[PDB]
Amino acid sequence: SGAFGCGSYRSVVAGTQNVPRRMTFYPSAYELIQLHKAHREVIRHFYVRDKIFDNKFPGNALANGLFKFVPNRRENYHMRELMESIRRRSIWMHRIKQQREINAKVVENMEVKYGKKAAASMLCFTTPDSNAYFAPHRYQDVANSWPNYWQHPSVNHVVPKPRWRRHRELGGITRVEDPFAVQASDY
Amino acid sequence: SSIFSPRYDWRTSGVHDIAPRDEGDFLYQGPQHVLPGAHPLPLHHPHNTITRPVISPYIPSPQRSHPYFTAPLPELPHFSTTKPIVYTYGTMKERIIAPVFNLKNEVIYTRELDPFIFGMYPEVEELSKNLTYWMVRCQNFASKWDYETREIWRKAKKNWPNTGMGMPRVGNRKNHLYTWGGRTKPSKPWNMLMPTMDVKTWSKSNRMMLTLKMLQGRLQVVDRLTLEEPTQECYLELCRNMSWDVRHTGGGVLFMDGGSRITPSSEFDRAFFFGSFFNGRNKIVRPTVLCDEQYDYNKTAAKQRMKGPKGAKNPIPINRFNAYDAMKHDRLVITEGALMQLEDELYEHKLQILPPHIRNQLPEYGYLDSEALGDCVPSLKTIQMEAAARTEEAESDMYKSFIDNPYNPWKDNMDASYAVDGADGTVQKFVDGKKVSWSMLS
Amino acid sequence: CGHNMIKMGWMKIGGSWKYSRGYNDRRRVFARGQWQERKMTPRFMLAPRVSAGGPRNRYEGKLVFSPLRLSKLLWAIDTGRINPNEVITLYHLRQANVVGEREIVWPGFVLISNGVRRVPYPIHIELQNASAESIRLIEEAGGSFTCVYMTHEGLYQELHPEEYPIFMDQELPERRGLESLATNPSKRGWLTRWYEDSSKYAHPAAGRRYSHYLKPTLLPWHSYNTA
Amino acid sequence: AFRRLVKRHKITNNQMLLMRRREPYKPTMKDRQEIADRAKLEEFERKNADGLMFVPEKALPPWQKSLAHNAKALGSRINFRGFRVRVADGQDEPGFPTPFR
Amino acid sequence: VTRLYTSYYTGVLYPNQLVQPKQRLPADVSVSAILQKRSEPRPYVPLGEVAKLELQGDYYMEGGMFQEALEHYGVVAKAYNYAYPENHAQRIGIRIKLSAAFRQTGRLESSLANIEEVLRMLDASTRPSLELICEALLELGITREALGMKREATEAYEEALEVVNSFHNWGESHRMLRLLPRLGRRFNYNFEEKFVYFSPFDYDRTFALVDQCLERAETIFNEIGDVEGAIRVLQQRKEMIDKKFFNMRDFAGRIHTMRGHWKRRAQHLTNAPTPDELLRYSPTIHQVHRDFKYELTAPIGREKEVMPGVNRLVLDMGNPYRRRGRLSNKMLKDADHKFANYVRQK
Amino acid sequence: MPRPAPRFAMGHMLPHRSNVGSQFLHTQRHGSRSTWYKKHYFSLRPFAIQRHHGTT
Amino acid sequence: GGFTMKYKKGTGLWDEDHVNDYKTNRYLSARATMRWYQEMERHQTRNSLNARRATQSHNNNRGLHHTGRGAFERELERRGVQVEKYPLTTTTGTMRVAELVILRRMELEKRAEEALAEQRGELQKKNPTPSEWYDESKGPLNPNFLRSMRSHYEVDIANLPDTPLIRGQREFF
Amino acid sequence: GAFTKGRRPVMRQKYSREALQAALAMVPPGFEVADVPRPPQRILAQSEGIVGRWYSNYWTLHSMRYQCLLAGVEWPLGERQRPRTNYDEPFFFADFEESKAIRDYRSRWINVNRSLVGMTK
Amino acid sequence: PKMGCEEITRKARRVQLQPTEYLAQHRMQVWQLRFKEMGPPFSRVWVALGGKMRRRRVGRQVDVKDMRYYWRPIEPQYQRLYMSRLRIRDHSNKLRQPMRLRATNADIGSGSSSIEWERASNRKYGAMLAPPKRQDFEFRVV
RNA sequence: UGUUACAGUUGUUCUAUAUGUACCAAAUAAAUAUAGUAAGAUUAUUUUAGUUGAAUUAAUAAAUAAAUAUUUAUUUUUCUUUGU
Ligand SMILES: NC(=O)c1ccc[n+]([C@@H]2O[C@H](COP(=O)([O-])OP(=O)(O)OC[C@H]3O[C@@H](n4cnc5c(N)ncnc54)[C@H](O)[C@@H]3O)[C@@H](O)[C@H]2O)c1
Numbered sequence A: 001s002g003a004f005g006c007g008s009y010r011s012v013v014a015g016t017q018n019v020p021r022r023m024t025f026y027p028s029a030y031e032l033i034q035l036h037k038a039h040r041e042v043i044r045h046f047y048v049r050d051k052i053f054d055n056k057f058p059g060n061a062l063a064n065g066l067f068k069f070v071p072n073r074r075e076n077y078h079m080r081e082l083m084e085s086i087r088r089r090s091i092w093m094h095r096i097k098q099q100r101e102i103n104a105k106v107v108e109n110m111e112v113k114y115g116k117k118a119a120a121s122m123l124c125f126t127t128p129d130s131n132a133y134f135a136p137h138r139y140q141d142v143a144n145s146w147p148n149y150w151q152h153p154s155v156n157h158v159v160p161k162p163r164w165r166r167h168r169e170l171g172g173i174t175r176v177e178d179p180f181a182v183q184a185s186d187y
Numbered sequence B: 001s002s003i004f005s006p007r008y009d010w011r012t013s014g015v016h017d018i019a020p021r022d023e024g025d026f027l028y029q030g031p032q033h034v035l036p037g038a039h040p041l042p043l044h045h046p047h048n049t050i051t052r053p054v055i056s057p058y059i060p061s062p063q064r065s066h067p068y069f070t071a072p073l074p075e076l077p078h079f080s081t082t083k084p085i086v087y088t089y090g091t092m093k094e095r096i097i098a099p100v101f102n103l104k105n106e107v108i109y110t111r112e113l114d115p116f117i118f119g120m121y122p123e124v125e126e127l128s129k130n131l132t133y134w135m136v137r138c139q140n141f142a143s144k145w146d147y148e149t150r151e152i153w154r155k156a157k158k159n160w161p162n163t164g165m166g167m168p169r170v171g172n173r174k175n176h177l178y179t180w181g182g183r184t185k186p187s188k189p190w191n192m193l194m195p196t197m198d199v200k201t202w203s204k205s206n207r208m209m210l211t212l213k214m215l216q217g218r219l220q221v222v223d224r225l226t227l228e229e230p231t232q233e234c235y236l237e238l239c240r241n242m243s244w245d246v247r248h249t250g251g252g253v254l255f256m257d258g259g260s261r262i263t264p265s266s267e268f269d270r271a272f273f274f275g276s277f278f279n280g281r282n283k284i285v286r287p288t289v290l291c292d293e294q295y296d297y298n299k300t301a302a303k304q305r306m307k308g309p310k311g312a313k314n315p316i317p318i319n320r321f322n323a324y325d326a327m328k329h330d331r332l333v334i335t336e337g338a339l340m341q342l343e344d345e346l347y348e349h350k351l352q353i354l355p356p357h358i359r360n361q362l363p364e365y366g367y368l369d370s371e372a373l374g375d376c377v378p379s380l381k382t383i384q385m386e387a388a389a390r391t392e393e394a395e396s397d398m399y400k401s402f403i404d405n406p407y408n409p410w411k412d413n414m415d416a417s418y419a420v421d422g423a424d425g426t427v428q429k430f431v432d433g434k435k436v437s438w439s440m441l442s
Numbered sequence C: 001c002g003h004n005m006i007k008m009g010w011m012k013i014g015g016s017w018k019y020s021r022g023y024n025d026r027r028r029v030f031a032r033g034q035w036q037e038r039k040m041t042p043r044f045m046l047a048p049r050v051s052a053g054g055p056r057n058r059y060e061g062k063l064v065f066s067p068l069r070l071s072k073l074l075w076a077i078d079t080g081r082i083n084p085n086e087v088i089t090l091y092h093l094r095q096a097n098v099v100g101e102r103e104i105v106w107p108g109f110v111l112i113s114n115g116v117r118r119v120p121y122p123i124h125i126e127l128q129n130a131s132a133e134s135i136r137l138i139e140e141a142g143g144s145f146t147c148v149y150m151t152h153e154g155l156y157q158e159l160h161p162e163e164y165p166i167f168m169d170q171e172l173p174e175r176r177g178l179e180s181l182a183t184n185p186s187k188r189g190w191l192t193r194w195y196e197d198s199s200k201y202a203h204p205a206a207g208r209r210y211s212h213y214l215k216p217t218l219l220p221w222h223s224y225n226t227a
Numbered sequence D: 001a002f003r004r005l006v007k008r009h010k011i012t013n014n015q016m017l018l019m020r021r022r023e024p025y026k027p028t029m030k031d032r033q034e035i036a037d038r039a040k041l042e043e044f045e046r047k048n049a050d051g052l053m054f055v056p057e058k059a060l061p062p063w064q065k066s067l068a069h070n071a072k073a074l075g076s077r078i079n080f081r082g083f084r085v086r087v088a089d090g091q092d093e094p095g096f097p098t099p100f101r
Numbered sequence E: 001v002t003r004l005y006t007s008y009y010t011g012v013l014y015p016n017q018l019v020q021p022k023q024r025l026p027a028d029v030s031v032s033a034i035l036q037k038r039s040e041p042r043p044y045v046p047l048g049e050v051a052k053l054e055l056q057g058d059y060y061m062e063g064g065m066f067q068e069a070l071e072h073y074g075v076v077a078k079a080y081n082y083a084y085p086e087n088h089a090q091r092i093g094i095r096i097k098l099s100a101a102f103r104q105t106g107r108l109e110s111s112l113a114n115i116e117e118v119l120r121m122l123d124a125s126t127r128p129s130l131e132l133i134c135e136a137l138l139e140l141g142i143t144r145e146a147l148g149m150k151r152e153a154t155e156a157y158e159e160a161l162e163v164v165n166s167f168h169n170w171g172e173s174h175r176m177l178r179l180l181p182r183l184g185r186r187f188n189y190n191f192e193e194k195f196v197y198f199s200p201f202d203y204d205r206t207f208a209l210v211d212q213c214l215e216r217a218e219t220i221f222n223e224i225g226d227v228e229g230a231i232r233v234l235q236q237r238k239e240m241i242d243k244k245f246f247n248m249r250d251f252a253g254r255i256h257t258m259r260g261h262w263k264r265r266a267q268h269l270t271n272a273p274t275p276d277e278l279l280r281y282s283p284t285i286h287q288v289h290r291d292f293k294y295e296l297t298a299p300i301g302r303e304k305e306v307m308p309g310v311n312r313l314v315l316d317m318g319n320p321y322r323r324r325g326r327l328s329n330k331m332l333k334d335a336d337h338k339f340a341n342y343v344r345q346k
Numbered sequence F: 001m002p003r004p005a006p007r008f009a010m011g012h013m014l015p016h017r018s019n020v021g022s023q024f025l026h027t028q029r030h031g032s033r034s035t036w037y038k039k040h041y042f043s044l045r046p047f048a049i050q051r052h053h054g055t056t
Numbered sequence G: 001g002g003f004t005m006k007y008k009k010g011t012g013l014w015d016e017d018h019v020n021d022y023k024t025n026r027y028l029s030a031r032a033t034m035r036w037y038q039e040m041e042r043h044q045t046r047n048s049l050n051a052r053r054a055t056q057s058h059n060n061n062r063g064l065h066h067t068g069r070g071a072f073e074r075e076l077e078r079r080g081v082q083v084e085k086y087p088l089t090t091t092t093g094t095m096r097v098a099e100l101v102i103l104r105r106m107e108l109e110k111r112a113e114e115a116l117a118e119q120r121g122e123l124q125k126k127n128p129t130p131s132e133w134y135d136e137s138k139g140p141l142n143p144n145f146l147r148s149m150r151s152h153y154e155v156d157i158a159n160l161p162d163t164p165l166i167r168g169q170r171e172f173f
Numbered sequence H: 001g002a003f004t005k006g007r008r009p010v011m012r013q014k015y016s017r018e019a020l021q022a023a024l025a026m027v028p029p030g031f032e033v034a035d036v037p038r039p040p041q042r043i044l045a046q047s048e049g050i051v052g053r054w055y056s057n058y059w060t061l062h063s064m065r066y067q068c069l070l071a072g073v074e075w076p077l078g079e080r081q082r083p084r085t086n087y088d089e090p091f092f093f094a095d096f097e098e099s100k101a102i103r104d105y106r107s108r109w110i111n112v113n114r115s116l117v118g119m120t121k
Numbered sequence I: 001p002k003m004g005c006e007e008i009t010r011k012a013r014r015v016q017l018q019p020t021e022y023l024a025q026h027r028m029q030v031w032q033l034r035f036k037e038m039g040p041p042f043s044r045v046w047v048a049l050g051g052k053m054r055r056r057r058v059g060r061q062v063d064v065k066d067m068r069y070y071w072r073p074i075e076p077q078y079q080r081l082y083m084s085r086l087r088i089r090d091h092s093n094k095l096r097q098p099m100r101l102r103a104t105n106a107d108i109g110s111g112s113s114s115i116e117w118e119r120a121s122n123r124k125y126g127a128m129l130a131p132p133k134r135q136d137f138e139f140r141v142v
Numbered sequence J: 001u002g003u004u005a006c007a008g009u010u011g012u013u014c015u016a017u018a019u020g021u022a023c024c025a026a027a028u029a030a031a032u033a034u035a036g037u038a039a040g041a042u043u044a045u046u047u048u049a050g051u052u053g054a055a056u057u058a059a060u061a062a063a064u065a066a067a068u069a070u071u072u073a074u075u076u077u078u079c080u081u082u083g084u
């Protein structure tokens, strides 16, 4: 079974010596995302299997205690969808745990070879543009990544600052005191 | 008529009575005369803060990026989002904080919003896709019927010879030329088309519409949507207390009931759902912006007795949030449970949208702590989802003594031996000299 | 808003129709054009047939693989989609979304070394019918390739492992596949060792050859022990 | 088989009412056919001024490249000089000495 | 057919030929008040012939014949002083040109005297032109820096900047020139109609005047050694050109070739709101006055402010099912009472 | 967006059957006119009479 | 007849999912919305009840129990042994889970509102006047929001002058 | 596909370990899986569950065989086919139905070794 | 028709949804037998083997060295006609490249990779392309 | 005068003409069955760019059919011009 990262029965029969592998650090971010969504999928499958009738109208209030699935379809759903999703979630968990063990080994080797702080600095995945995604208030002075660029504090001088004032005779309406500019209208 | 036409200015007199009515007509005093309705910009809907009042800390100003708080207030308790905040390609790149309203029309505390949800800057093409899909879908397709020439019930025989009398050459004369005949290509419900909407575009346009409502300042977050009694008078009293103009003419209200902050749910509150049925401009929608993947099991007209338009056989339900209803209803009221559900359903989407060099930093910063692996306590979920999770946890004990345990599949995979039997022509699995593999039947 | 009447352009509705019958023959599927057929025979009638099936005929079991760029694999590995600490298979590719289900057609894939002249790290991958150059690159880097030439049922079982609770007897590939890729030592087939093993030809009881995994629960609910 | 519906043009000069041909400075149909034939022949002669440059196997048309490659990949797998495969298809003989030859 | 343009070809009518008005100073604010707040901390005259003479004079000044430009300017300025009343725009402009010619010839004292007289005439004027006042005090600054008053020249340039930043509209110059690329309907040929460009240095002369003011101010600051002043002036110049570009900004319509639909130019050529006026009079800051005396709808509390009527009887809500049978009418029974209790008075 | 929804099928145009038109273009029924108050080409539009079309 | 995704029919979170509804309208009144919900629930319930009735009648006609079980399973139930391999959760179990979850939610809401009232009292006692957010430097405030926040301060918040009051310009209240 | 047994289960009842053992007790001693043949294609592939004489049903017999393999129940009956690996008693057999001589493990073992050797690419 | 016409008051035959054509109906076997499609995406040429195909009496064309095996591209007008016959499908979509002469892995995959085939375990990943599996040893028919 | 028997694949007991209920390819009911397809109609002004009598080789290694229409692509020299 090649689902896990160990190898398939075909590789076992071939006898390819792939046992000693280069232990490289791997955060498994994609695998963690997939595990999150698979967990949500399993929970949703359990919900849709355990959905029972709850009707709010008198014409349909005769079957308010039954499952919305007939027993046969409920059994078939539990046998295919629910437990296939559970098996996929288990595969993801197994892969991520294997990678976590390998990462712990790599961290230990790096700490004993260089030191704690050196290994942490070498394993840190920080990019000079990480603030553009995690804290843009620290990236404002680097580049203008705003969809409304005219309001960026670097280009903010272009946005006009009208002189508004409230008018009680108009019902608290705010109105701009800037006089309009004459427009070209004939030629 | 068209402006470039002779018939455009051929009415020279008779349009206006020279005498003005002594009730509403007035004269132009001059430049300082404030005329009602006059505005420099072309506004086909000239409303103000009195006719269509906005519900936000500030009036939307060009000097402000959004008409809400940018930092938590020191006198109000601040609640962060249920999921961590990540800024993608379309987000506003600025902190959005909105006040949560109590059903007594009071601000109890304040809550951070997600830029991926309410920060996806709107685009007219995406909103147009959303609106066009919604209208073409909400059209009624059963009434698209029309008669064909072969559905006229006339004798299948030439009425008169072509050269005999002075009448023109014709045969069955049941075609469209005659007032009683039908068309060769008539309108049919099965010949009409229903468009297909992809989940990506649907979610993007819905989040753009939410961001547009937030920018205009007509988004209001409440803690609950509950009524003491399931009657309509209690709903109308709640609307009168919250200043919700649910009249057919006032600025309508669009509710998104997702439950409380501590008690979220995917089902509407029963009392509020029974009370909200009022003949006005109010609509309640499901707490979701995503949609199911649409399919078509008759793409090649294999099932001929199909009655229904070509295209997607799984269109978007009516009670879903959409650009049409968001534009028709002025205010958008959203509950904290609905906020939590939106965040939970869009978390993995925005994480997959993220670029790789930033995705590799997610477990470093702590955005991928999965409770399934035991690195954190489980996160808050809806009532139904927590019930399903508890049901799974309880039923997990039955898969212990069986080899088909999904929580531990193929546990004897490393300890077994694989043998290639060429006489049988198969590879088999053995444990202690016993064939544990299974030959599939037939 | 108009009629693309041929050889006239986009004409206006309600305009002139007296100079367009090619437009009527375009609307109605009726066609003409014997100006080239009046004297000479068509090219498909003049050309002979190389075989009864035709060139590039995709007969049953032709082994038409979809290409997989070694550069694409290395890009996925450097990006972080694929974990190099494990043995990469087609299931791992599909789960990491490196290839779409549209491309997966029996037989699975072929590793092609287009745009790569050196592999920096050892990679252990299982595929079908990799190129000699790509195999050499992987071996020089230090990895290992295994030409896992599987049947249709084996491919489906490798792509959907959750539909099978236990291991099941997987049939050996066809004669052509056995002679081409499975028992080919150049392709590093997964049955070359079994084919070279001569202890199976002596006695029928000695025909079976066992093989073991080489050597150096998952419950989501964990006890709240931190306090 | 020409356009029976004559093209209309905005008349800016009254002599456009008199002129029948749109571009009078443009040669007639057969004249410009002959002109195009002559110009293309001169360009072809300029292109063939130098001899037929023999081309390696990779810069061949698709319907010859892979055939010529497969016709000698077997001998190319064994590195030794002086192995030639006389393939039927390929570039034809010029018939005279060529500087590229 | 190509056009040789041998014969006389009448020009074409294009929206760039629209007669653009002049930016006027408001009647309340005065140039005298601006200077004070800065210091705190008709008869017949052959005007066609004198215009020929003034054009020849400015041609001489541009070619470098300063004395001839000066005498031409003197003649035409005498003519204008006779032809126009006191404190006239053309009068003050021609004596601006005269002071410039004096300064170029080397009579710096008389140039300064004439430019101060220009300043006092501008103060006496009611609504002078922004371009006129900017050019006047630009000539003032150049005369000051020629005399040796570099700080005062920088002060004049900075007051030009502060006037143009407070009274000049940066988007009015390209209001009718911004949607012009949408007129092009061909992509293979004549595709420069989709890329028609109009430089602001030709359609906003106040912009060019202030640009030259800031350039000279930066030069003087670099000569003196005032890095702070140089940075300030360069920042303001960059902000001005950025405002101009932003007001010229616009997205693209259809890219490829469109056949027909010639009546879309009515929609293309319109008083399209410039970005500046859009962001200024956004319907939320500059709200629309809406009086309910002329309306049939009003807020919940302000029910009596609606347009009045005679013998108004509230029948019911227009429930479209009231036309149906007795069961539908029974279903629409208490809705009217509940609506009344909903819109009751506080 | 895979084949965005057609603008002509948006339910805002029920036109007379013309020469050009898509297979998904819902035109007016045979024998029925597009505009309701246009009994003739010279028929006027009723001043205060409003015919609710489409939705309720 | 023919192929239709019965494996998807009934899989959504609600009854309206995976229903080919092509007879709707862009605006639905109160009666139209009530009938839409009624028809969705009726479609689901009619499908389920008709399937159950057909299955039970077919089993009874074939001579089995209405669930399809036979004499072997009946004798197993008599002896007391478990018949099926996987006994799934019943309606009573699902309703009990929903009930206990809702009760836990209610208790958590009680404790949360207690703690939140405590924190709000502390914050209001600490801050008598509004913070930096009460400024007009970028634009006007909103009278509706001010009338909603009136109850949080001692001074009059909704009373706004016509001038764009600025924090550092003039001391408020 | 819906008539014959193609990729499709035929017995939907999934019994517990005790129900599997109780269903095996009603099998008479002396019964072997090799006794029940595979029904032809034109015969509908169905399973009535655990009824009287259920072992006579080929599809019910092997469906229960797979369920006992999952639940870990010792299968009392024999294998569907017994492989002949060595030359022992009986040293000769009679088969008027010409199937035993070709279905023999020893007869098909050598035919595979002939083909494995005959490959000459 | 009219609102109360006798033609519509009485019932008649009712038209049904018409069946569509085969998706690959307009690709012909003559092309697949004669030519083959070569070249990069936007420079594709259909080539057919050259030479004069003719069956003569015994004793003519003895020297086999003249008969050469070589492929030459067919006339561009014929290639355009044969490519338009493939363009027939989905005419209004201008962003859709013409159909290919021989089916590819991508097309055979798209045939079943849609949403409406996600549950069909069969006809997935080239089931008909793959060779057949071994039937049961006790296989028989009636 | 009426009634019988004969009905179109043919009937009036050979054939031909004639005729078989007001146009003998008889009449009634269904058909988009299909005519290498003869012809007739084909709904919407104020417009915005190239050619007006060419091309024409059945069939082994020869640079290229041309006109019309729709999209689209080449700012290289020079006294001016030049729809490639
Ligand atoms: N083409 C195929 O044969 C195919 C395809 C996909 C999956 N599978 C899986 O292969 C296995 C055996 O297939 P087969 O053709 O040999 O037999 P089968 O699937 O035709 O019959 C298996 C028997 O065991 C029962 N069973 C199946 N899964 C069970 C489980 N998890 N626990 C208890 N009882 C269970 C079935 O209901 C039936 O009685 C099954 O798990 C099946 O789902 C087979």
Ligand SMILES: [Mg+2]
Binding pocket: C053, I029
């Ligand atoms: Mg074929």
Ligand SMILES: [Mg+2]
Binding pocket: I024, I025, I026, I027, I028, I029
């Ligand atoms: Mg075909």
Ligand SMILES: [Mg+2]
Binding pocket: none
């Ligand atoms: Mg006769």
Ligand SMILES: [Mg+2]
Binding pocket: none
């Ligand atoms: Mg052309």
